[PDB]
Design a protein around this motif. Structure first.
Motif, PDB file in Angstrom:
ATOM      1  N   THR A 161       0.856  -1.159   0.000  1.00  0.00           N
ATOM      2  CA  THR A 161       0.000   0.000   0.000  1.00  0.00           C
ATOM      3  C   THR A 161       0.895   1.211   0.000  1.00  0.00           C
ATOM      4  O   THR A 161       1.907   1.247   0.690  1.00  0.00           O
ATOM      5  CB  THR A 161      -0.879   0.007   1.248  1.00  0.00           C
ATOM      6  OG1 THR A 161      -1.781  -1.095   1.168  1.00  0.00           O
ATOM      7  CG2 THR A 161      -1.650   1.331   1.375  1.00  0.00           C
ATOM      8  N   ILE A 162       0.527   2.196  -0.799  1.00  0.00           N
ATOM      9  CA  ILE A 162       1.287   3.411  -0.856  1.00  0.00           C
ATOM     10  C   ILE A 162       0.392   4.525  -0.376  1.00  0.00           C
ATOM     11  O   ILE A 162      -0.751   4.671  -0.835  1.00  0.00           O
ATOM     12  CB  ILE A 162       1.802   3.678  -2.280  1.00  0.00           C
ATOM     13  CG1 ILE A 162       2.763   2.550  -2.687  1.00  0.00           C
ATOM     14  CG2 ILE A 162       2.505   5.026  -2.342  1.00  0.00           C
ATOM     15  CD1 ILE A 162       3.186   2.591  -4.135  1.00  0.00           C
ATOM     16  N   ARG A 163       0.897   5.287   0.585  1.00  0.00           N
ATOM     17  CA  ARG A 163       0.107   6.350   1.174  1.00  0.00           C
ATOM     18  C   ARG A 163       0.865   7.643   1.023  1.00  0.00           C
ATOM     19  O   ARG A 163       2.068   7.705   1.263  1.00  0.00           O
ATOM     20  CB  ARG A 163      -0.164   6.054   2.644  1.00  0.00           C
ATOM     21  CG  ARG A 163      -0.774   4.673   2.863  1.00  0.00           C
ATOM     22  CD  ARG A 163      -1.274   4.509   4.296  1.00  0.00           C
ATOM     23  NE  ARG A 163      -1.868   3.194   4.468  1.00  0.00           N
ATOM     24  CZ  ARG A 163      -1.186   2.114   4.827  1.00  0.00           C
ATOM     25  NH1 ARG A 163       0.114   2.201   5.087  1.00  0.00           N
ATOM     26  NH2 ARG A 163      -1.806   0.946   4.945  1.00  0.00           N
ATOM     27  N   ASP A 164       0.150   8.673   0.604  1.00  0.00           N
ATOM     28  CA  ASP A 164       0.726   9.993   0.573  1.00  0.00           C
ATOM     29  C   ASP A 164       0.144  10.802   1.699  1.00  0.00           C
ATOM     30  O   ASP A 164      -1.053  10.716   1.996  1.00  0.00           O
ATOM     31  CB  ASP A 164       0.467  10.670  -0.763  1.00  0.00           C
ATOM     32  CG  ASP A 164       1.432  10.221  -1.822  1.00  0.00           C
ATOM     33  OD1 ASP A 164       2.604  10.004  -1.476  1.00  0.00           O
ATOM     34  OD2 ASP A 164       1.027  10.086  -2.992  1.00  0.00           O
ATOM     35  N   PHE A 165       1.006  11.602   2.311  1.00  0.00           N
ATOM     36  CA  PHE A 165       0.609  12.498   3.367  1.00  0.00           C
ATOM     37  C   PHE A 165       1.178  13.872   3.099  1.00  0.00           C
ATOM     38  O   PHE A 165       2.087  14.059   2.284  1.00  0.00           O
ATOM     39  CB  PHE A 165       1.165  12.027   4.704  1.00  0.00           C
ATOM     40  CG  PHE A 165       0.828  10.613   5.028  1.00  0.00           C
ATOM     41  CD1 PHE A 165      -0.295  10.313   5.785  1.00  0.00           C
ATOM     42  CD2 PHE A 165       1.626   9.578   4.568  1.00  0.00           C
ATOM     43  CE1 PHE A 165      -0.614   9.001   6.074  1.00  0.00           C
ATOM     44  CE2 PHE A 165       1.320   8.255   4.866  1.00  0.00           C
ATOM     45  CZ  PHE A 165       0.194   7.967   5.617  1.00  0.00           C
TER      46      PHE A 165
END
Ligand SMILES: [Cl-]
Length: 286
Positions: A161-165
């Protein structure tokens, strides 16, 4: 002579694989004591002991990531070390999966140390046990001390999973992006069955890192921040080595990692897995 030219790596690998990985076992055994006499005084300070996920995974003072201090010197403490990458001594920070009481510290490190990429190599829970706090927010902003983080996107695949913040320091009004590469598919036991997924995942991280400013350490963690973490860091380094020099020195890399944090590449299986990675990369060079 731990430097193996890629043209000789396959033969070397077969040699080292003989007799139940005897040669690899020997190399790995030779690494056993590396770095272990490096002082870890900060990690052992009473106030800091509870900031360590595992009592036997303590950052060496010589390489430990030191945070800002507010009221007490131990404010500087986080269970994390700068790990050299191919390019510089601070290409990486290897750290443990943070604890409920080190979440603020974790984000403070992320902020203060200019982290734009986090590589997370564990599920939060593995075999019914907490390996890592879910230290990141959803779309709803969360404050971790002075650092506010809000997730801007999340893409889930089975493999990762790739999450941007957006990470913001509320005190300074400074902000910047952070992408978290969450490798969720490392087996609960042993190493991945194949190397391609982790290697492709590394490529994804690297693709993103090309967009990132200089002196931005990749923060890599699993549980203890040594096994999977060290494996990932080593793979990244090996790929550069292969690409840039047509040679590999897994031993030299892991040695270097061990001089920066205990237990980096924590099992022999991982060490062999690294060699498998090299073999697969070389073979996948048509
Ligand atoms: Cl160094």
């Amino acid at each position: 002579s731990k430097l193996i030219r890629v043209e000789n790596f396959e033969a070397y690998f077969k040699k080292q694989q003989a007799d139940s990985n005897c040669g690899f076992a020997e190399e790995y055994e030779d690494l056993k004591l590396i770095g272990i006499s490096l002082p870890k005084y900060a990690a052992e300070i009473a106030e800091n002991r509870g900031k360590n996920r595992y009592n036997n995974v303590l950052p060496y003072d010589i390489s430990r990531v030191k945070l800002s201090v507010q009221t007490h010197s131990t404010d500087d403490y986080i269970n994390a070390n700068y790990m050299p990458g191919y390019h510089s001594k601070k290409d990486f920070i290897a750290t443990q999966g943070p604890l409920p009481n080190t979440l603020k510290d974790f984000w403070r490190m992320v902020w203060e140390k200019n982290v734009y990429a986090i590589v997370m190599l564990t599920k939060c829970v593995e075999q019914g046990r907490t390996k890592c706090e879910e230290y990141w927010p959803s779309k709803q902003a969360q404050d971790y001390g002075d650092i506010t983080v809000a997730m801007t996107s999340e893409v889930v695949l089975p493999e990762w999973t790739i999450r941007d913040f957006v990470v913001k320091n509320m005190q300074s009004s400074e902000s910047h992006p952070l992408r978290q590469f969450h490798f969720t598919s490392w087996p609960d036991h042993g190493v991945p069955d194949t190397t391609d997924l982790l290697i492709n995942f590394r490529y994804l991280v690297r693709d993103y890192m090309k967009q990132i400013p200089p002196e931005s350490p990749i923060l890599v963690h699993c549980s203890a921040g040594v096994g999977r973490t060290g494996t990932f860091i080593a793979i990244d380094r090996l790929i550069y080595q292969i690409e840039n020099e047509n040679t590999v020195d897994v031993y030299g890399i892991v040695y270097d990692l061990r001089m920066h944090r205990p237990l980096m590449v924590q099992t022999e299986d991982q060490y062999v897995f690294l060699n498998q990675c090299v073999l697969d990369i070389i073979r996948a060079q048509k």
